[PDB]
Amino acid sequence: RLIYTAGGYFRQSLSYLEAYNPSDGTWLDLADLQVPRSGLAGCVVGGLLYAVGGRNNSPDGNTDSSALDCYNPMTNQWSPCAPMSVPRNRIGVGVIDGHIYAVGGSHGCIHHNSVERYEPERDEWHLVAPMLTRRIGVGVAVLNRLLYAVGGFDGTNRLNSAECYYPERNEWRMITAMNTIRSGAGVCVLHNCIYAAGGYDGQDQLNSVERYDVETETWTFVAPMKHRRSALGITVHQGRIYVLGGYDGHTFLDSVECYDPDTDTWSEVTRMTSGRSGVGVAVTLE
Amino acid sequence: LIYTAGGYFRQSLSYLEAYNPSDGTWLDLADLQVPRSGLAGCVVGGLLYAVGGRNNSPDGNTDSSALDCYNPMTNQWSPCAPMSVPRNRIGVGVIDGHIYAVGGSHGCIHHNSVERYEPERDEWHLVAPMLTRRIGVGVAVLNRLLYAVGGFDGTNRLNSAECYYPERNEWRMITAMNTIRSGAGVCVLHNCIYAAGGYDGQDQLNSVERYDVETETWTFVAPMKHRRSALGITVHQGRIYVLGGYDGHTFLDSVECYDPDTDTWSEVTRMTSGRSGVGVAVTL
Amino acid sequence: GRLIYTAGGYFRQSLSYLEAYNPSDGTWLDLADLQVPRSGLAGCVVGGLLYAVGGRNNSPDGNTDSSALDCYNPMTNQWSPCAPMSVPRNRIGVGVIDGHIYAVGGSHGCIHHNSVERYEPERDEWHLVAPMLTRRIGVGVAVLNRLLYAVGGFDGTNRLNSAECYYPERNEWRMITAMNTIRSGAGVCVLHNCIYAAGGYDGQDQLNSVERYDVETETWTFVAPMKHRRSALGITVHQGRIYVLGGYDGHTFLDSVECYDPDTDTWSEVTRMTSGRSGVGVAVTLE
Ligand SMILES: O=C(O)[C@H]1CCCC[C@H]1C(=O)N1CCc2ccccc2[C@H]1CN1Cc2ccccc2C1=O
Ligand SMILES: O=C(O)[C@H]1CCCC[C@H]1C(=O)N1CCc2ccccc2[C@H]1CN1Cc2ccccc2C1=O
Ligand SMILES: O=C(O)[C@H]1CCCC[C@H]1C(=O)N1CCc2ccccc2[C@H]1CN1Cc2ccccc2C1=O
């Protein structure tokens, strides 16, 4: 199993697809994106990698993407899918029951609260209930077959607020708020807990990490990361969180750290081929 | 008993029902002649009037000038004198047993016009127009003056409100709300103009504020649980009731109740089905 | 005063012109241009110095909202930089209360400000004060009775007719009676103890009407309308007569300069600028 990292930003928008194998610490150099992107999000469904949204930041000039592309590792080749109803930069995604859910993000000055769903068998996007709050730089995680949107930016305020999506009822409920305000945080699920790592609070790029216990309904600080970072890639691989790249106010990171929850500590396990931020990250299943 | 006439869900509705705020029960009364959404309701001389609105079938949209009349006894609607113009997204208030029609729209025509109705004669007579063209306007009556609050003018949603003195027959602009609202629930309680919900051109609202006539100041209070515009509003014995509306995607059945003593909301039932743009009134 | 200044503006791109009109003998002096072109800036005079606040640079190769504050010295004919604002502010409003310059609202990209900050020229420092109740860009500002009035504007989605008032001693904002007409980018000033709101845009048409606020009656009253429709107009008072300079009227940029005589209650076109422009910052040498 591999950890994929697509696109991102370094001086201009990137189009790299690379993969990291954690069994031997070795990097792979696969087929590049058709159009460069940053602020996209990645996910895996039935052995295919999907790249959703983001923005093409060239020097002349900018374009928010509504595209859905599909990489087949058997053929090493990208293929266009049906686009989203609207452009979505700094987007969140989750996978529930083999359906991709695109969450918030931005199209220019428009900050979305709307959410839509993709069915890979039919190749069609369909709108579902919008969030209670507009969010770009939102971080998404899927636990107990419920979608979770955490933090972000609503056009005016950076957020510590968090809400939860019940797919069967088709509705969003606001849950307990984070201790710290975060936008562009890495959000994922591990051992029945939601983890919020890094992000931006309007002042500083953060290194603090907090986790949500759904049953105690309370956020809890855990061991912080070595490097401060926002717009970071993140994924879980065998009871271990992996964070990739991001922005720290001055430089772009190539550092990759790995969290072991048994010992509650972070450790620098590799570094990317070049520093970058706003990557789409995802990992092959089971 | 609290009536709910008309509404919208997939298309305009002809439902008339009534909720019992003591034991919580929904009576199934006579449907409307014509299905109407965006209508308003009021009660004069123990009769239920459905003023203006819009029929929205799957093959035609017709803005209504019609005024209907429901008789509690017979369970039966009676066509009355129609208004000079159609008014969808209207507001009403009753001073001196006369029904005031405020604002509304007819296609692309947004009205600053207002017309009074006299049930003793079955006659609509126009009066001083408002300073602002207002659709999705909310109307409240207090100290026997009429207040037009919020609305949409064709380009801008409004936080301004204005006051009609029926003695000199003129409008004067008052202190504007802290928030811009169109299609909000407006009403009077303990000598205060309350305003709940609405759309500001961006999001549906769940905030609530109220106007104090002596201080002339809009103050926020505790916000509703659910975001909603095109809701039905009414006061029943020292507390406000809100019914249905549109949150930006689905149509609410939730019915929240505001206690001004505790300054808190609570869901005290749900409608027989989800719907927005209801005409709502309670029997005096 | 003595001279009426017009700074910056827009015609095809952001301009950097500084010019001054003498009202006694009707002459235009071509003074030194701004370091940076800007439109939507504001102008005020404090202690014989002309300050140009905020605005946006609209070049034909990128746009930049300005947090800048530059001061012009008429004696030296030179523009001197000062301490910049906490945030950039396009389409800004300013008043001067007791030697300090208030910067009110405006925009920076997608962000519409309800925040307000004050400048101390003795110290060269900006300090945030209580923010407004509403987010306002293209807001008009008028100093009366050592209170700061914030009139009309645009909140990002809707054009506004609301007005609100700032009490510097309590450091708090109260909402007052709204204008009869919605105005965004109006010209706002004070004359004979009344706030005048002239011109503006209401989402549909540029305006030519003029209303005014009597502080004791708490009411807005129309007066004689201007000859030309205009928004983003500079405005100032000089010897009991209001002066309006330039603006946008839906298709062209005005060079005309009308003058309201409060007694006759009539406007009259008293000159033209060297070229038409909108979004100018305007001030007058103090009395
Ligand atoms: O608007 C984008 O999509 C582009 C705009 C150009 C800069 C890189 C993109 C960006 O804004 N990113 C990446 C994607 C993303 C995703 C989630 C949250 C935050 C971000 C921000 C994070 N930041 C901030 C920043 C400031 C200055 C220089 C670099 C960066 C940077 O990399
Ligand atoms: O009025 C109308 O022309 C109709 C148009 C068809 C849908 C129902 C009517 C409507 O839109 N109404 C209901 C009455 C009313 C009263 C006050 C203020 C606003 C409204 C709007 C509120 N909205 C907006 C909306 C969009 C999409 C789907 C449903 C709705 C909805 O219900
Ligand atoms: O975003 C801006 O700052 C620039 C954008 C380019 C046009 C000039 C600037 C502008 O829009 N301004 C000037 C400053 C200002 C101040 C207050 C209120 C309104 C304005 C508007 C007035 N408008 C409107 C307009 C439309 C089309 C062409 C010209 C204009 C114009 O000049």
mmCIF file of C-alpha atoms and ligand atoms in Angstrom, chain A residues 9 38-39 55 57 89-90 137 183-184 230-231 247 252 277-278, ligand 1:
data_model
loop_
_atom_site.group_PDB
_atom_site.id
_atom_site.type_symbol
_atom_site.label_atom_id
_atom_site.label_comp_id
_atom_site.label_asym_id
_atom_site.label_seq_id
_atom_site.Cartn_x
_atom_site.Cartn_y
_atom_site.Cartn_z
ATOM 1 C CA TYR A 9 2.187 24.769 -4.524
ATOM 2 C CA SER A 38 -3.230 23.483 -5.328
ATOM 3 C CA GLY A 39 -5.900 23.309 -2.612
ATOM 4 C CA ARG A 55 -6.853 26.108 -7.913
ATOM 5 C CA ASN A 57 -2.122 29.401 -9.586
ATOM 6 C CA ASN A 89 -10.439 25.787 -4.007
ATOM 7 C CA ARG A 90 -9.245 24.672 -0.552
ATOM 8 C CA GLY A 137 -9.558 25.351 4.318
ATOM 9 C CA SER A 183 -7.903 26.862 8.868
ATOM 10 C CA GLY A 184 -5.935 24.641 6.505
ATOM 11 C CA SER A 230 -0.733 24.828 7.418
ATOM 12 C CA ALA A 231 -2.230 23.450 4.181
ATOM 13 C CA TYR A 247 3.359 26.356 4.799
ATOM 14 C CA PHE A 252 7.549 25.453 2.146
ATOM 15 C CA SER A 277 1.942 23.117 0.364
ATOM 16 C CA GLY A 278 -1.735 22.473 -0.419
HETATM 17 O O1 LIG D 1 -5.268 30.295 -2.781
HETATM 18 C C1 LIG D 1 -4.568 29.195 -3.174
HETATM 19 O O2 LIG D 1 -5.044 28.071 -3.262
HETATM 20 C C2 LIG D 1 -3.135 29.505 -3.477
HETATM 21 C C3 LIG D 1 -2.886 30.999 -3.578
HETATM 22 C C4 LIG D 1 -1.420 31.222 -3.847
HETATM 23 C C5 LIG D 1 -0.648 30.709 -2.657
HETATM 24 C C6 LIG D 1 -0.823 29.210 -2.552
HETATM 25 C C7 LIG D 1 -2.277 28.805 -2.437
HETATM 26 C C8 LIG D 1 -2.761 29.039 -1.027
HETATM 27 O O3 LIG D 1 -3.368 30.056 -0.724
HETATM 28 N N1 LIG D 1 -2.464 28.040 -0.108
HETATM 29 C C9 LIG D 1 -2.258 26.660 -0.482
HETATM 30 C C10 LIG D 1 -3.589 25.955 -0.501
HETATM 31 C C11 LIG D 1 -4.229 26.128 0.831
HETATM 32 C C12 LIG D 1 -5.161 25.200 1.236
HETATM 33 C C13 LIG D 1 -5.777 25.325 2.458
HETATM 34 C C14 LIG D 1 -5.462 26.380 3.279
HETATM 35 C C15 LIG D 1 -4.530 27.307 2.876
HETATM 36 C C16 LIG D 1 -3.907 27.189 1.654
HETATM 37 C C17 LIG D 1 -2.897 28.216 1.259
HETATM 38 C C18 LIG D 1 -1.724 28.113 2.211
HETATM 39 N N2 LIG D 1 -0.750 29.145 1.984
HETATM 40 C C19 LIG D 1 -0.997 30.508 2.397
HETATM 41 C C20 LIG D 1 0.119 31.202 1.717
HETATM 42 C C21 LIG D 1 0.436 32.539 1.723
HETATM 43 C C22 LIG D 1 1.542 32.946 1.001
HETATM 44 C C23 LIG D 1 2.310 32.041 0.291
HETATM 45 C C24 LIG D 1 1.990 30.699 0.286
HETATM 46 C C25 LIG D 1 0.887 30.323 1.012
HETATM 47 C C26 LIG D 1 0.347 28.983 1.165
HETATM 48 O O4 LIG D 1 0.824 27.987 0.639
#
